[PDB]
Write a protein that binds this ligand. Structure first.
Ligand code: NI
Length: 341
């Protein structure tokens, strides 16, 4: 049955709640983004109204076959009315199409649900700056001080420089990038752009990417693997066996693989700077794990909350153990005492 932290009090709404069958009293289902742990349950047989971004709505129609009459895409940064309640969608700085949702309840309460987000100071100048928020439903994925990671910009610099060096030393090396969901597209697109190649991929992944409004996508991606020296493969195939196999399939076009696994976090971060990262190597295959995150670090999360000063925080992640919950609640109290709210 539906957990309380997916339910918006004083409305008929739910958020990211499609795996519970018909939720009692739900008149509209919102979807923050197209990741399977959040859309799980949607299909062509869903007949309740779904509210979401334009990009998310493209993906629902084309990938899951949800019928068009039930998809209600909303523009960003725009006050809209849903079943008599004012809502706004804000950019979540997560994956393409991912939003945060502001709800303005009829009794004066204002609620922000972050969905999945990577907090950024740019958010301190959206429609959030303009009123008080009473309740924050917060993506607490990395809510512990050990989770530090570099900016996305520093991680993409490292990846472009590494790949450009490798292919310039050996014009017969192939670059491979792992993927399993939308998100982290900058990794493979920035590498392709520095090498003057398109990114080659399966027809299914190409279709997914064409749903995203990314300018000049026909320009950067392709299904013709032969013509490309940057290949996208499932994340599961990013190991020595999977990559030796792929290299066999390229018919002696290539004699080395440099592969990237963009992970969220790995405990290498506590002891290492980005500059100091090294691959795992076997034979003519090297694998780099790079800390490209689409969730807030601990310090990013803390800053956002100390700026917003909500009255009540409801975590949405790590809520299944008493130790995790207690840890998070202790950090929330620290933040509030330090900031004076
Ligand atoms: Ni997500």
């Amino acid at each position: 049955t539906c957990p309380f932290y997916k339910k918006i009090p004083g409305t008929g709404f739910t958020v990211d709640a499609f795996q519970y069958g018909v939720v009692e009293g739900c008149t509209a289902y919102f979807l923050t983004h197209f990741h399977s742990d959040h859309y799980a349950g949607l299909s062509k047989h869903f007949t309740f109204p779904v509210y979401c971004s334009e990009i998310t709505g493209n993906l629902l129609k084309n990938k899951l076959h949800v019928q068009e009459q039930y998809i209600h895409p909303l523009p960003l940064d725009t006050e809209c009315i849903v079943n008599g309640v004012k809502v706004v969608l804000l950019d979540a700085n997560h994956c393409p199409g991912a939003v945060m949702i502001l709800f303005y309840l009829p009794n004066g309460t204002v609620i922000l649900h972050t969905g999945d987000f990577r907090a950024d100071p740019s958010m301190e100048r959206s429609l959030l700056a303009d009123q008080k928020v009473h309740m924050l439903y917060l993506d607490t994925t990395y809510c512990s001080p050990e989770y530090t990671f570099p900016s996305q910009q520093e991680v993409i610099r490292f990846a472009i420089n590494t790949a450009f060096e490798a292919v310039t030393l050996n014009p017969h090396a192939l670059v491979v990038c792992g993927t399993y969901s939308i998100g982290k597209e900058k990794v493979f697109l920035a590498i392709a752009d520095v090498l003057g190649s398109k990114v080659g991929m399966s027809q299914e992944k190409y279709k997914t990417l064409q749903c995203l409004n990314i300018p000049e996508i026909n320009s950067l991606i392709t299904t013709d693997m032969c013509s490309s020296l940057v290949h996208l493969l499932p994340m599961m195939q990013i190991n020595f066996k999977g990559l030796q196999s792929h290299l066999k399939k390229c018919g002696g076009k290539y004699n080395q693989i440099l592969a990237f696994r963009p992970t969220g976090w790995t405990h290498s971060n506590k002891f290492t700077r980005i500059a100091d990262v090294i691959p795992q190597t076997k034979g003519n295959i090297s694998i780099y794990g790079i800390p490209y995150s689409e969730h807030s670090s601990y310090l990013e999360m803390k800053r956002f909350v100390q700026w917003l000063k909500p009255q009540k925080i409801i975590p949405t992640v790590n809520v299944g153990t008493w130790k995790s919950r207690s840890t998070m609640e202790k950090y929330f109290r620290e933040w509030k005492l330090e900031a004076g709210y």
